[PDB]
């Protein structure tokens, strides 16, 4: 359908590839800035080549070369950053350089940061260490608005192939497990679960909208505002097997976690903000925000029934 | 010096160990705080039991636990943080949790934080990203100060084994080269290179002395304000023989620094700021502030002549 010029930086990553094919399939002339890490990464490269035999343009650029970054950005309207990796620190704060490069140029009509999760300044009163992610992304958010860039913060919640795959288990397997399932407390506390393609499709549809201007865009697809136990229940209904439930709680689980060291207590206490303090649905949308599914009613969201209807 | 009970945070890191020996040697009931480094390291645990053996008393407690910390601290009178890692600069902003316990238990008569290098208050103008060291440590200093916690900030410059022992090279090899060497700029700019065990002494003679209360002690040894070409002469032109030399420029050598990884850009920004901008010695020290060597006559510091004849 539309002609806007998007630059995706971060686009060899996990949600980035979803954003990238969304651009191309919803009519955007897409450009993908990539780093140097063509160095031994055949995987990253063949995907770029894959992106390129679809019609994308590839920009060799690094983030440190400020003058090429501005050159590059002058060629496009929107810039989407899907820049993320490990500790969610070393690579989220690189985007500051990209804000500095956007301030300097003037032709960007919209900048969408490396969000795609919980929403950093919705309190995130959060248990440490993994409180850093929301700290980092705020520095980036507060610097965008300072320099009065046009933004849309795409707070999109849980990717289904990360939490409904695993069924949210502490072991990191990306498959729903036979026999047991650990539940967090009650497992009644509501969560939101979204197909990685519905997140890309909804961010390329925010892109040029007057309505998503300086507003936070929540994807809260009505059908997928589900508790932990109810996603376990779609598996049960699907695999045709009833698992053996255990359930677990706050206190020495949080000091356990606070002694199992970083990256392990970052994923825990995030998973503990999702299914205990309930930071996915425990709040208002109201005035400086919107919902992705209300706005684009025509878009097609996948339910956790249809998403799990392939994990088996 | 003499019988104040020191608690030592970061007591198994590079300079940390050094302050523990000194603590013990100078007659203080040494109390070594340690996280679960149990979890990980054999050599850290054997190091601790060495302290234990030598005279010290061990307190295992995280920085995440306020109960253990406040109470562990009520035993002592002086805390001394030497919280290491450069990648572990999260460990500077770890001392934020600790200060909120150093005040919450009162009692402490002199807290001196994880300093031991360049003075960050020398309103660092420091290059991005290495300034993002001085930021974290300027956050603590202000926290000690508003919180009306007493202090002594030890600024001690370059640890000799890490700078004289390297001849401040950049390939990483922690011994002085036999063949090739990179000289920064022209290599005439000044550094103060101190020995790690006098860092420890001069630190410990500073904790109960009415001149260091709430000031910055610098350690500027006279026989050790030298430049890189000058500690390189000492290496060859006295102790080895002769290095084929090469001069790197301020310019596209700041670009050399430009394409590397976040923790490499930092060391470079710190090098490329002692040897180039001159920051160890391009300033006016004083007039309420003090100097270790001058203040503590009795200690016969170790020269860069004596230190590198250990490398021969």
Swiss-Prot record, chains A, B:
Gene Ontology terms describing biological process: (+)-lariciresinol biosynthetic process; (+)-pinoresinol catabolic process; (+)-secoisolariciresinol biosynthetic process; (-)-lariciresinol biosynthetic process; (-)-lariciresinol catabolic process; (-)-pinoresinol catabolic process; lignan biosynthetic process
InterPro entries found in the cross-reference section: NAD(P)-bd_dom_sf, NmrA-like, NmrA-type/Isoflavone_red_sf, PCBER-like
EC numbers, comma separated: 1.23.1.1, 1.23.1.4, 1.23.1.3
Listed Gene3D superfamilies: NAD(P)-binding Rossmann-like Domain, UDP-galactose 4-epimerase, domain 1
Keywords for this protein: NADP, Oxidoreductase
Positions of substrate binding: 270
The reaction(s) this protein catalyses: (+)-lariciresinol + NADP(+) = (+)-pinoresinol + NADPH + H(+); (-)-lariciresinol + NADP(+) = (-)-pinoresinol + NADPH + H(+); (+)-secoisolariciresinol + NADP(+) = (-)-lariciresinol + NADPH + H(+)
Claim: Acyltransferase is one of the keywords in the record: no
Residues annotated as the enzyme's active site: 137
GO terms for MF: lariciresinol reductase activity; pinoresinol reductase activity
Pfam families: NmrA
Domain of life of the organism encoding this protein: Eukaryota
Residues engaged in binding NADP(+): 10-16, 35, 44, 141
Cross-referenced CDD domains: PCBER_SDR_a
Primary role: Reductase involved in lignan biosynthesis. Catalyzes the enantioselective sequential conversion of (-)-pinoresinol into (-)-lariciresinol and of (-)-lariciresinol into (+)-secoisolariciresinol. Can also convert with a lower efficiency (+)-pinoresinol into (+)-lariciresinol, but not (+)-lariciresinol into (-)-secoisolariciresinol. Abstracts the 4R-hydride from the NADPH cofactor during catalysis.
SUBUNIT field: Dimer.
Family indicated by similarity: Belongs to the NmrA-type oxidoreductase family. Isoflavone reductase subfamily.
Misc note: Phe-163, Val-267 and Leu-271 are involved in enantiospecific binding of (-)-pinoresinol while in PLR_Tp2, a 'Gly-268' and a symmetric substitution between Phe and Leu favor binding of the (+)-antipode of pinoresinol.
Name the UniProt record assigns to this protein: Bifunctional pinoresinol-lariciresinol reductase 1
Source species of the chain: Thuja plicata
Lineage: Eukaryota, Viridiplantae, Streptophyta, Embryophyta, Tracheophyta
């Amino acid at each position: 359908d539309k002609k806007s010029r998007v630059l995706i930086v971060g686009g060899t990553g996990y949600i980035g590839k979803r954003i990238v094919n969304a651009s191309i399939s919803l009519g955007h002339p897409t450009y993908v800035l990539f780093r140097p890490e063509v160095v031994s990464n055949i995987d990253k490269v063949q995907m770029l080549l894959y992106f390129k035999q679809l019609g994308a343009k590839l920009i060799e650029a690094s983030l440190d070369d400020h003058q090429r970054l501005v050159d590059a950005l002058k060629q496009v309207d929107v810039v989407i950053s899907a820049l993320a990796g490990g500790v969610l620190s070393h690579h989220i704060l690189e985007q500051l350089k990209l804000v500095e490069a956007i301030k300097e140029a003037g032709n960007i009509k919209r900048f969408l940061p490396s969000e795609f999760g919980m929403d950093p300044d919705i309190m995130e009163h959060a248990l440490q260490p993994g409180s850093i992610t929301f700290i980092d992304k705020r520095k980036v958010r507060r610097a965008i608005e300072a320099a009065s860039i046009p933004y849309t913060y795409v707070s999109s919640n849980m990717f289904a192939g990360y939490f409904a795959g695993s069924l949210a288990q502490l072991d990191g397997h990306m498959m729903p497990p036979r026999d047991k399932v650990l539940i967090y407390g009650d497992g009644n506390v509501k969560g939101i679960w979204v197909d990685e393609d519905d997140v890309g499709t909804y961010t390329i549809k925010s892109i040029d909208d007057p309505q998503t201007l300086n507003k936070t865009m929540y994807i809260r697809p009505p059908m997928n505002i589900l508790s932990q136990k109810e996603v376990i229940q779609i598996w049960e209904r699907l695999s045709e097997q009833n698992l053996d439930k255990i359930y677990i709680s706050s206190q020495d689980f949080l000091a356990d976690m606070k002694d199992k060291s970083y990256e392990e207590k970052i994923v825990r206490c995030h998973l503990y903000q999702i299914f205990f303090r309930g930071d996915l649905y425990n709040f208002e949308i109201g005035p400086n925000a919107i919902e992705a599914t209300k706005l684009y009613p025509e878009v097609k969201y996948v339910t956790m029934d249809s998403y799990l209807e392939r994990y088996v």
